[PDB]
């Protein structure tokens, strides 16, 4: 279980919420996005 | 009949037809024109729109930084086209629907004016149903009627 | 003002394995009788299957409360599907179930 | 090689497990031997690797458990957890 | 048991029915709902014979039902008491005629 | 995979044995009350009564299931249009979708999204959702007609064991979620206040 | 005793025959449950009663 | 058990042990005796819960 | 039990994909009257269509599992009397060798 | 039972009291399509069950692994190999008769001596 979880599943949870986007108007507007990549474990 | 240990050394002891050439139709129309599959549930033999009626018209029918739910664009674009396709006269009626099960991997064999074919995939599929042919509906009286 | 070119064009739609599906994103029909056979282009030779000889109330249209330029191609004469050469396909099928991730 | 299969509870519903391989798989006396059933049935699909393996970790240590009143086995499995001994070599 | 009527096999069987709840559905097999054009004459043949027996303006529905003999013959009874019971249950409006 | 919804659709065979009103209501999530299922068949897009039964009683010759289906069918007489049913369902649960043009579209939201988090959570497969529902009510009549035993829920095949892997996962799933929300908060204020 | 063990086996075996006949009788729709219990209900009674009798 | 064909009401299948503690039980028999033995434990646990409470 | 092991769960995608390529008639196009004797196919309790010759299908599957084409932890059950074929790849099932 | 349906409308047909011709019609409550009644029967309840007792028999039932086997003959087929099972109606009141499956003429005979 633990090895399977560490190897495969742990990457999944990162994937489903990797990105969150933020936008604010101007006076053309601008928008900000933060995204997650591969997971690395020491 | 008891346990054993000394069997190991035994292992050491054991040791006509119509060829129609094809070609993908050019892509500029594919940008402008999207092709889909039409289907009916009339149970009719053909149910051709030729016999349906004339005319025919088929068409669909200060805040700060904020956490917004996400969605893949094609679904998001598909989220926006929620208007049902409707063909009418100005009296028989037809309304389509999305199936999303077999619009993915299909390329059709258009047997064109020439014997050869242009092979065309399907962008979408739609399920048009004959509706209101008997033309009865009680959307408002139903709530009262259910008490009898 | 929907356009109807013929609405009687025959089409033989086919379900294909992804390996066949992805490769098309020519043909040589050697119809034999009901021993339907198909000569693929070069690599294997996979025949056609009589998925359903007659298929009704299904039609092909194209589109270009606002309508668009809608044209109708025709009807599915016979729903078909590829008959997967096959040993390599079976080998490919076994190979297909042996992928992985990073 | 596909000589031994993996089976869960649901899969057990639709199989026919023979108890001991040579006891039953081939077709066809000391009274002190325990009386067993025969292999009248033929359409088997699996045979138990060894019936004694249905026990757990604590239970397995019981000598001749099939010669005991079953709740006694439970008691031994309980105490066996608090048996003074040597738990690790370090 | 009754003091004098003790150790009497048959006498006990008399009482056995007397208290035992006997639902009509416990003997019925099936119920048939028919349309009969004549209140007197019935399309089915088995119905016509009994009619003149109790004979010699009514709804054209027909209700017929079937019961098991042995289930009846466990708590043995007669349909004659059944019918008047049914009659006296609601009224003599529900014209009921039963097989013997 | 994904938020591990705890949506537990239920089917209720209303009406006791013998006594009338042997109609069957379901319970879609996020809905005020229970709903007769024949609406859902229309709601998912099965208008005629014959199609509804064909989605449940897979055998034509068998009729007792159809017999028990008869009352619930007539309970759906009041609706003959999917949208009418759909819009009506939108009324039936948390109707705060004040715009009626958005109130009826709320019904399609629940069925697509909140209804059966398994077989799909995209759009279009509404027919497939019906069949599973139609299959589900096929089982219920069978048990109600005593051709199958009551489902033993102590059977081990119906059990699953969650080891350290999944136990960490779901526990980690939430912990990671709270991390993101906090990162949004800091991300909001800097955009809010042009800070570093 | 060897004899006693053998006699035991006869006792167990004779019980099976009692069971076997009753089993088939049920399969021939012959067994008649007395008033107040089902056929299977009655069928189990004789079965269990035989085995307990046999052991005792 | 998966070791039996369906519809086997014979005593060795429905849970009658014919062997004796002197010469051990067969698995199918042995496993059954576990359930029968267990049922007492649960009951004895319950009686400690119930009888103790009632007596109070 | 000493032989017991717990399924870690796999991706069901290959099977379902493989199923379609071996005559599983898709459910969206299923017409029960037109195929009265169909065999419903489930995957982790998720109906994905019907079939018409399950016996051909079944032993074909097990061979793949025994070939190692299908991961051996994947449980699959053919229930003849119910006209139903089930497949499981869930994580957390309890399985033993045989 | 065995109730036809509408056409171009396809809905279940309620009965309609045809008194003038003194018969029974069947109406589609969706569209006014109406046709007669095919049988004088209207409704049967059938409190006791005698249908579905023989469920599961197909071309492949006898190829089941776990069913117990037997050796009696199939009467018409005169073949003395068969497979069998218990009554498929899982109801307590049901008797414990047996049903057998031929493999030669696939004739499905019960084990009853009372009424064949
Ligand atoms: Zn109609
Ligand atoms: Zn025969």
Swiss-Prot record, chain B:
It is found in: Nucleus. Phosphorylated on Ser and other residues by TAF1 and casein kinase II-like kinases. TFIIF is a general transcription initiation factor that binds to RNA polymerase II. Its functions include the recruitment of RNA polymerase II to the promoter bound DNA-TBP-TFIIB complex, decreasing the affinity of RNA polymerase II for non-specific DNA, allowing for the subsequent recruitment of TFIIE and TFIIH, and facilitating RNA polymerase II elongation. Belongs to the TFIIF alpha subunit family. Present with 1920 molecules/cell in log phase SD medium. TFIIF is composed of three different subunits: TFG1/RAP74, TFG2/RAP30 and TAF14. This is Transcription initiation factor IIF subunit alpha. It comes from Saccharomyces cerevisiae (strain ATCC 204508 / S288c) (Baker's yeast). The lineage of its organism: Eukaryota, Fungi, Dikarya, Ascomycota, Saccharomycotina. The chain holds residues 21 to 415 of 735 of the full protein.
């Amino acid at each position: 279980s633990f090895n399977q979880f560490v190897d495969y599943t742990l990457q999944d949870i990162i994937c489903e919420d990797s990105t969150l986007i933020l936008e604010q108007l101007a006076q053309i507007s601008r928008k900000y996005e933060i995204s997650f990549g591969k997971i690395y474990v020491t | 009949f008891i346990k054993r240990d000394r069997m190991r050394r035994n292992f050491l002891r054991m040791r006509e037809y119509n060829e129609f050439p094809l070609r993908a139709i050019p892509k500029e129309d594919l940008e402008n024109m999207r092709t889909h599959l039409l289907k009916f549930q009339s149970k009719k033999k053909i149910n051709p729109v030729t016999d349906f009626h004339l005319p025919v018209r088929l068409h669909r029918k200060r805040k700060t930084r904020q956490l917004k739910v996400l969605d893949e664009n094609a679904k998001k674009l598909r989220f926006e086209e929620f208007y049902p396709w409707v063909m009418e006269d100005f009296y028989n009626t037809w309304v389509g629907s999305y199936e999303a099960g077999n619009s993915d991997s299909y390329v059709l064999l258009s047997v064109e004016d020439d014997g050869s074919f242009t092979m065309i995939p399907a962008d979408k599929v739609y399920k048009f149903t004959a509706r209101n042919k008997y033309a009865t509906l009680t959307i408002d009286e139903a709530e009262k009627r259910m008490d009898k | 003002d929907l356009d109807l070119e013929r609405s009687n064009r025959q089409v033989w739609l086919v379900r294909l394995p992804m390996f066949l599906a992805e490769k098309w994103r020519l043909g040589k029909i050697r119809i034999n009788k009901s021993k339907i056979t198909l000569l693929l282009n070069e690599p294997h030779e996979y025949d056609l299957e009589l998925t359903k000889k007659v298929v009704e109330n299904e039609y092909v249209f194209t589109e270009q409360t606002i309508p668009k330029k809608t044209a109708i191609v025709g009807t599915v004469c016979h729903e078909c599907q590829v008959m997967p050469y096959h040993k390599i396909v079976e080998q490919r099928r076994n190979i297909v179930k042996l992928n992985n991730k990073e | 090689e596909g000589l031994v299969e993996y089976i869960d509870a649901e899969e057990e519903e639709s199989i026919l497990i023979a108890m001991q391989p040579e006891d039953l798989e081939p077709a066809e006396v000391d009274p002190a031997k325990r009386i067993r059933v025969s292999h009248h049935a033929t359409t088997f699909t699996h045979c138990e690797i060894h019936p004694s393996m249905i026990l757990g970790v604590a239970a397995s240590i019981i000598p001749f458990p099939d010669h005991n009143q079953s709740p006694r086995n439970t008691y031994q499995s309980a105490m066996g957890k608090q048996a003074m001994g040597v738990f690790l070599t370090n | 048991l009754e003091p004098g009527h003790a150790a009497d096999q048959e006498q006990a069987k008399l009482i056995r029915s007397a208290i035992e709840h006997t639902t009509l559905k416990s003997v019925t097999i099936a119920s048939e709902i028919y349309y009969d054009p004549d209140p007197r004459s019935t399309v089915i043949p088995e119905d016509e014979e009994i009619i003149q027996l109790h004979f010699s303006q009514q709804s054209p529905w027909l209700l017929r039902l079937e019961l098991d003999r042995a289930a009846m013959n466990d708590k043995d009874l007669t349909m004659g008491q059944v019918g008047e019971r049914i009659k006296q249950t609601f009224k003599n409006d529900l014209f009921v005629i039963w097989s013997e | 995979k994904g938020s591990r919804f705890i949506s537990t659709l239920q089917v209720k065979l209303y009406g006791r044995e013998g006594s009338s009103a042997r109609t069957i209501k379901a319970t879609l999530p996020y809905i005020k009350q229970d709903i007769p299922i024949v609406i859902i068949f229309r709601a998912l897009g099965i208008i005629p009564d014959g199609e509804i039964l064909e989605h449940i009683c897979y055998d034509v010759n068998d009729w007792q299931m159809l017999e028990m289906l008869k009352p619930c069918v007539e309970d759906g007489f009041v609706i003959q249009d999917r949208e009418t049913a759909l819009d009506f369902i939108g009324r039936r649960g948390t109707a705060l979708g004040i715009k009626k043009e958005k109130r009826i579209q709320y019904a399609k939201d629940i069925l697509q999204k909140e209804f059966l988090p398994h077989i799909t959570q995209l759009e279009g497969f509404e027919s497939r959702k019906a069949f599973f529902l139609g299959y589900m009510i096929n089982r219920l009549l069978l048990c109600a007609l005593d051709r199958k035993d009551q489902d033993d829920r102590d059977h081990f095949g119906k059990k699953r064991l969650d080891l350290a892997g999944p136990l960490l996962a779901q526990l980690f799933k939430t912990l990671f979620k709270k991390l993101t929300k906090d990162i949004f908060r800091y991300m909001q204020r800097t955009v809010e206040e042009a800070h570093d | 005793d060897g004899p006693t063990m053998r006699e035991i086996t006869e006792t167990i075996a004779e019980a099976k025959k009692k069971v076997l006949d009753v089993t088939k009788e049920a399969q021939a729709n012959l067994l008649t449950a007395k008033h107040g219990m089902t056929l299977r209900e009655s069928f189990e009674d004789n079965v269990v009663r035989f085995l307990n009798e046999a052991r005792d | 058990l998966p070791h039996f064909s369906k519809d086997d009401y014979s005593p060795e299948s429905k849970g009658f042990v014919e062997n004796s503690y002197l010469r051990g039980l067969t698995p199918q028999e042995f496993f059954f005796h576990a359930m029968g033995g267990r049922e007492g434990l649960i009951d004895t646990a319950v009686k400690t819960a119930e009888t103790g409470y009632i007596q109070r | 039990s000493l032989m017991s092991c717990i399924s870690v769960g796999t991706d069901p995608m290959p099977i379902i994909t493989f199923l379609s390529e071996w005559g599983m008639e898709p459910l969206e196009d299923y017409v029960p009257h037109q195929s009265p004797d169909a065999t419903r196919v489930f995957v982790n309790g998720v109906w994905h269509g019907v079939h018409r010759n399950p016996a051909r299908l079944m032993e074909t599957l097990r061979t793949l599992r025994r070939k190692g084409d299908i991961n051996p932890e994947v449980s699959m059950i053919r229930d003849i009397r119910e006209k139903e074929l089930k497949i499981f790849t869930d994580a957390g099932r309890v399985y033993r060798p045989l | 039972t065995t109730f036809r349906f509408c056409r171009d409308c396809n809905n279940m047909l309620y009965p309609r009291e045809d008194k003038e011709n003194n018969r029974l019609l069947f109406e589609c409550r969706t569209c006014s399509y109406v046709e007669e009644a095919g049988s004088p029967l209207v409704y049967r309840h059938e409190l006791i069950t005698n249908i579905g007792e023989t469920a599961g028999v197909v071309q492949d039932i006898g190829s089941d692994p776990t069913l117990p086997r037997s050796d009696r003959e199939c009467p018409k087929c005169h073949s003395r190999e068969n497979v069998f099972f218990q009554s498929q109606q899982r109801r307590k009141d049901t008797s414990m008769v047996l049903f057998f499956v031929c493999l030669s003429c696939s004739h499905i005979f019960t084990s009853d001596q009372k009424n064949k």
